[PDB]
C-alpha cells in the first residue's frame, strides 16, 4: 500500500496512477493508455 513511493531515489517516470516505475518515459506512455477508461479517485 503506497510503499516505497520514490523508486531508486532518483526521479522515473513511475505511474501516478497506480504506481509503475517504467524505465523511459515511452514505458509509461504506453502503459498509462490502458487507464484511459476508468474514472480516477479525483483527490483534489
Ligand atoms: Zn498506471
Same mark, same amino acid.
Given at each position: 500500500?503506497?510503499?516505497?513511493?520514490?523508486?531508486?531515489?532518483?526521479?522515473?517516470?513511475?505511474?501516478?496512477?497506480?504506481?509503475?516505475?517504467?524505465?523511459?518515459?515511452?514505458? =509509461?506512455?504506453?502503459?498509462?493508455? =490502458?487507464?484511459?477508461?476508468?474514472?480516477?479517485?479525483?483527490?483534489?
Amino acid at each position: 500500500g503506497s510503499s516505497g513511493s520514490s523508486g531508486a531515489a532518483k526521479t522515473t517516470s513511475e505511474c501516478q496512477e497506480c504506481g509503475k516505475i517504467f524505465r523511459h518515459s515511452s514505458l =509509461l506512455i504506453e502503459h498509462q493508455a =490502458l487507464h484511459a477508461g476508468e474514472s480516477g479517485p479525483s483527490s483534489g
